[PDB]
Amino acid sequence: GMSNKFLGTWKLVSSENFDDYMKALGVGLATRKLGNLAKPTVIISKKGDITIRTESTFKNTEISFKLGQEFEETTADNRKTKSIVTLQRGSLNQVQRWDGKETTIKRKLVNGKMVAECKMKGVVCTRIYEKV
Numbered sequence: 001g002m003s004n005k006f007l008g009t010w011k012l013v014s015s016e017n018f019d020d021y022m023k024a025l026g027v028g029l030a031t032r033k034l035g036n037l038a039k040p041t042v043i044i045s046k047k048g049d050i051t052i053r054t055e056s057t058f059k060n061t062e063i064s065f066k067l068g069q070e071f072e073e074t075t076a077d078n079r080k081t082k083s084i085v086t087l088q089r090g091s092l093n094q095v096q097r098w099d100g101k102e103t104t105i106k107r108k109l110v111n112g113k114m115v116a117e118c119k120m121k122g123v124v125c126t127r128i129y130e131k132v
């Protein structure tokens with residue numbers, strides 16, 4: 001199952017190419033400006049379902065799911081998606097589908113950091129988090 005090394009509170013330390021990723025999702029300019037200034041905390045826990053909670057001054061989000069079971073998600077930019085989280089070679093892989101579009105957020109552990117790779121339409125964003 002998901003490694004217990006994911007569990008905990010993680011703080012964003014680096015983000016590369018977020019603005020073009022948000023653009024590819026359809027996010028408007030003023031929201032992107034705030035999204036690029038945000039430094040969220042991500043809290044991963046498990047109590048039956050796995051929960052991934054994101055906290056920031058601009059927006060908070062939360063998803064709770066079982067691996068491999070499609071669920072309804074509301075994203076930080078207020079998309080209403082059908083999403084599935086899978087585990088592949090230790091990476092926690094989230095696909096979101098809405099309005100015939102798809103994006104993936106792969107989260108993996110690298111030397112104790114958590115690396116999120118976000119992909120939309122060939123645009124790739126990398127966000128690196130350190131455990132608190």
Ligand SMILES: CCCCCCCCCCCCCCCC(=O)O
Pocket residue numbers: 022025027031032034035036038040042054056058059075076077105116118127
């Ligand atoms: C994530 C909260 C702050 C961002 C607010 C701007 C709205 C666009 C959000 C795009 C989806 C977020 C992808 C997050 C990946 C990650 O967990 O690092």
Ligand SMILES: [Cl-]
Pocket residue numbers: 037038039040055056057058
């Ligand atoms: Cl913030």
Ligand SMILES: [Mg+2]
Pocket residue numbers: 014015016
């Ligand atoms: Mg940066």
Ligand SMILES: [Mg+2]
Pocket residue numbers: 016017018019020
């Ligand atoms: Mg950018």
